[PDB]
């Protein structure tokens, strides 16, 4: 992370003595806690599953994970949210009947 000292290149810029600022507590906003993990797991067993989540579980078992991600993308927004939802359904499947 040391600059070269010339005006152009990969690590261009002037070399100065570096300091590491103290970490800001606001950078841990989306971090899970013991209280929040306990509540979310308990609510999951109470409320059950959404109608579209049941369809994804059927697709994973009968049609494969690749197609379930395609369907999950349409129901959700971005393609990256489909991966998280499909991965979440796999953990549910691994414990519902597989164990």
């Amino acid at each position: 992370t040391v600059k070269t000292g010339i005006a152009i290149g990969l690590n261009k810029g002037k070399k100065v003595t570096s300091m590491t600022p103290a970490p800001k507590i606001s950078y841990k906003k989306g971090a899970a806690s013991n209280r929040t993990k306990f509540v979310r797991s308990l609510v999951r067993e109470i409320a059950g599953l959404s109608p579209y989540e049941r369809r994804l579980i059927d697709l994973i078992r009968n049609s494969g994970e690749k197609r379930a991600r395609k369907v999950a993308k349409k129901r959700l927004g971005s393609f990256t949210r489909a991966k998280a939802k499909v991965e979440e359904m796999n953990n549910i499947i691994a414990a519902s009947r597989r164990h």
Binding site: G5, I6, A7, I8
Partner: protein, 148 residues
């Protein structure tokens, strides 16, 4: 001032300099740049070639600060040294006592070589330099240091 205009001279001459036949009407020929391709084409093809059409490629969200790089020629290099010190350095051309010139501190980005500098060693600090500019500095005994 109004007392020196031709309006005062035109008093009592009916047409006020606009002619009897053509007259002074509202907008004969249109307003603004109207008719630039139909009845003003000749005046556009000459005096303004290249007006109609598009050429290059677009650049979304252009920041002019990225392209800041004022140029300095070698014939103006010694002006950056204060005048009270130029005489002593010129007559004391030697190593180990070469004056240092910070071109960035004077607000320039790149050094170009156009003129001729005295045969005196000078230490030049800059962000960018042309190939010819560096050669003339070294030919006089000086060196170029890259900064950022």
């Amino acid at each position: 001032p109004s007392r020196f205009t031709k309006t005062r001279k035109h008093r009592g001459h009916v047409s006020a300099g606009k002619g009897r036949i053509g007259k002074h009407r509202k907008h004969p020929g249109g307003r603004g740049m109207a008719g630039g391709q139909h009845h003003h084409r000749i005046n556009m093809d000459k005096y303004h070639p290249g007006y109609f059409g598009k050429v290059g490629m677009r650049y979304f969200h252009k920041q002019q600060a990225h392209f800041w790089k004022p140029v300095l020629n070698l014939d103006k290099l010694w002006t950056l040294i204060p005048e009270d010190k130029r005489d002593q350095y010129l007559k004391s051309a030697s190593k180990e006592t070469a004056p240092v010139i910070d071109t960035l501190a004077a607000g320039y980005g790149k050094i170009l070589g156009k003129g001729r500098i005295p045969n005196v060693p000078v230490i030049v600090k800059a962000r960018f330099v042309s190939k010819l500019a560096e050669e003339k500095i070294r030919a006089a005994g000086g060196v170029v240091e890259l900064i950022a």
